[PDB]
Design an enzyme around this catalytic site. Sequence first.
Site, short mmCIF file in Angstrom:
data_model
loop_
_atom_site.label_atom_id
_atom_site.label_comp_id
_atom_site.label_asym_id
_atom_site.label_seq_id
_atom_site.Cartn_x
_atom_site.Cartn_y
_atom_site.Cartn_z
N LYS A 12 0.84 -1.19 0.00
CA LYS A 12 0.00 0.00 0.00
C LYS A 12 0.89 1.26 0.00
O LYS A 12 2.04 1.21 0.41
CB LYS A 12 -0.93 -0.02 1.24
N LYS A 16 7.64 0.99 1.48
CA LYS A 16 8.28 0.17 0.45
C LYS A 16 9.63 0.78 0.07
O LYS A 16 10.63 0.07 0.04
CB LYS A 16 7.42 0.09 -0.82
N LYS A 49 5.56 8.04 -7.73
CA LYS A 49 6.03 9.06 -6.80
C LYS A 49 7.46 9.51 -7.16
O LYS A 49 7.82 10.65 -6.89
CB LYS A 49 5.96 8.57 -5.35
N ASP A 51 -1.29 -0.23 -4.69
CA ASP A 51 -2.67 0.19 -4.40
C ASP A 51 -3.65 -0.39 -5.42
O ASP A 51 -4.79 -0.68 -5.08
CB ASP A 51 -2.77 1.71 -4.37
N1 ADP Z 1 11.01 1.06 9.68
C1 ADP Z 1 10.58 2.34 9.71
N2 ADP Z 1 10.69 3.07 10.84
C2 ADP Z 1 10.28 4.36 10.90
N3 ADP Z 1 9.74 5.00 9.85
C3 ADP Z 1 9.58 4.39 8.66
C4 ADP Z 1 10.00 2.99 8.51
N4 ADP Z 1 9.73 2.64 7.24
C5 ADP Z 1 9.18 3.72 6.61
N5 ADP Z 1 9.11 4.76 7.47
C6 ADP Z 1 8.52 6.09 7.17
O1 ADP Z 1 7.25 5.93 6.53
C7 ADP Z 1 7.08 6.94 5.52
C8 ADP Z 1 6.71 6.28 4.19
O2 ADP Z 1 7.80 5.49 3.73
P1 ADP Z 1 7.90 5.06 2.19
O3 ADP Z 1 9.10 4.15 2.02
O4 ADP Z 1 8.01 6.29 1.32
O5 ADP Z 1 6.55 4.26 1.79
P2 ADP Z 1 6.16 3.90 0.27
O6 ADP Z 1 7.41 3.63 -0.53
O7 ADP Z 1 5.28 2.68 0.30
O8 ADP Z 1 5.42 5.07 -0.34
C9 ADP Z 1 8.38 7.73 5.46
O9 ADP Z 1 8.19 9.02 6.06
C10 ADP Z 1 9.40 6.91 6.24
O10 ADP Z 1 10.33 7.70 6.98
MG MG Z 2 7.69 5.24 -2.80
#
Ligand code: ADP
Ligand code: MG
Lengths: 280, 280
Positions: free
Chosen positions: B16, B21, B48, B135
Amino acid sequence: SFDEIAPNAKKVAIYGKGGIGKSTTTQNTAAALAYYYKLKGMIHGCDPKADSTRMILHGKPQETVMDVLREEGEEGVTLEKVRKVGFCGIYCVESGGPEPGVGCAGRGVITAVNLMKELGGYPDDLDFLFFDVLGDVVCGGFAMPLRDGLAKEIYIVSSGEMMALYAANNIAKGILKYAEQSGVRLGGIICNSRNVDGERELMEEFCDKLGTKLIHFIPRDNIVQKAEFNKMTVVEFAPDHPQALEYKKLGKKIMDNDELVIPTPLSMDELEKLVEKYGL
Amino acid sequence: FDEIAPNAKKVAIYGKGGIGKSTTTQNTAAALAYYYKLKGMIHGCDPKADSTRMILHGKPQETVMDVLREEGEEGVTLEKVRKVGFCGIYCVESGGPEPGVGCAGRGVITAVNLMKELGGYPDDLDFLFFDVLGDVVCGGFAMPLRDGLAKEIYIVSSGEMMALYAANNIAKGILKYAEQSGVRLGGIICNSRNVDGERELMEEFCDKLGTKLIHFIPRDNIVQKAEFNKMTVVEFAPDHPQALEYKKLGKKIMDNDELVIPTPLSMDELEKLVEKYGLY
Ligand SMILES: Nc1ncnc2c1ncn2[C@@H]1O[C@H](COP(=O)(O)OP(=O)(O)O)[C@@H](O)[C@H]1O
Ligand SMILES: [Mg+2]
Ligand SMILES: Nc1ncnc2c1ncn2[C@@H]1O[C@H](COP(=O)(O)OP(=O)(O)O)[C@@H](O)[C@H]1O
Ligand code: SF4
Ligand SMILES: [Mg+2]
């Protein structure tokens, strides 16, 4: 044409990130408009999750248009199987979609809207018509309400989260793209609170940069979960609860809204620096 | 698509939006290239376009669609679409069309084909990760499973209903394309949200889905502190417990042999499971 369907109704489409609270807001707002103001309404679920009309139908899941077409076929389809009546006579329809990995997920939206028009499933005497649309991606059937002018007024549900604001900005980009062609406009941003410090302040600056207004701030309340457990909306469960009155305020704001504007999407740098400024 | 990087472990990370990710994929790749000195590459398949930012030390990468649009297929070079970051980890961002224009996943097909043509997938690669938007399982997002681009899939999820719903939908796409492409589910990666009994709910979810909870990543503030310094957690503090957690996960993915076709849960089964723990 998409302008002849329910002409006396305020056609609105609710967009937003997955799990942000679109179904909760759309259902409770419609329930408030049909209960407090006695308005005739209808909800057309354009999210493949197919749960955008569960609380209105009192916990009973609705058979999607794609499911009925798949089993009964175009010959055995009746308006009674695809459109159900729930709380305060609100009509409900779920577009549905194909199995994950098969075709385009948005295709279910186009088929359902065309079928509803064919069967006359949108009452002319409607006062409001809401479309719960998936906003994680602006493409195919999900972007159809913006492109074909199905709903002229769009509202995006968002929180202080970066992903929620990113999705809202992307939806605004889609609105701007077909604003002059279809006449679609952004009514405002609805904030579904997550109980974080300075969430409203970040949202109000985001709306200022986006060229719109923060139409309403919905607080995070466990009454939603308590009502969802009794298989009912918050309005039906406790119409005197402050939360039910919040949806009533938003409902009136949407009905009497006139500040519909073409958005000024933020750049990826502007969004990140705005998120860093508040640092929730 | 089996001839591209044959000596590499082709993996695709789904989940999601905002589940973690990009954070997991980047830090896992950084751990594999730093601690185990493995040659790796990250192909961002999320519109993104920030799945290769921390590896490139905060520097934004021009997407394939951006380079292709402003320079044409002739003015394209590997130097412009493929960049080198932390520990020689190669980086590519597929990108996508403007919101509301065409199919969001189109950028993935164009980027994978273009890399295949320019030979941008080193044969001597040890691992190749694809950060894919989960998603919606369709178009370019469902392509990696379809064409067997990555034979091993891992889904990042949390105790949230929406995160588990998305993971179940991705599993449905894997099952449909399991015999045609030979794609398989390696396991579910849990990105913790610091809620009570999150691991217990995730383990029962994996049991019902016919897979294993390969790893439990804890929620640590060091991610945001390393992000502030424009670096991955591995590059920022390789001795921090969090950086290690990604090292454990990295080895688990490399030495994984328990690949299984998923048994997707029904909507009832998932709801009753969420209610059993009632995390939120
Ligand atoms: N293990 C973790 N501990 C703390 N924060 C995390 C962790 N993994 C992700 N985050 C936070 O969650 C948010 C979304 O992460 P993201 O990797 O961009 O998700 P996605 O790739 O699915 O869009 C970011 O602000 C990131 O700092
Ligand atoms: Mg991303
Ligand atoms: N104002 C609110 N207060 C408390 N919980 C909420 C509120 N709005 C939404 N929720 C909860 O958030 C979750 C997701 O809501 P939902 O309407 O289904 O989002 P979406 O339709 O965008 O996926 C649900 O469990 C719901 O109970
Ligand atoms: S247009 Fe959108 S919903 Fe349709 S296949 Fe492409 S990414 Fe999926
Ligand atoms: Mg929903």
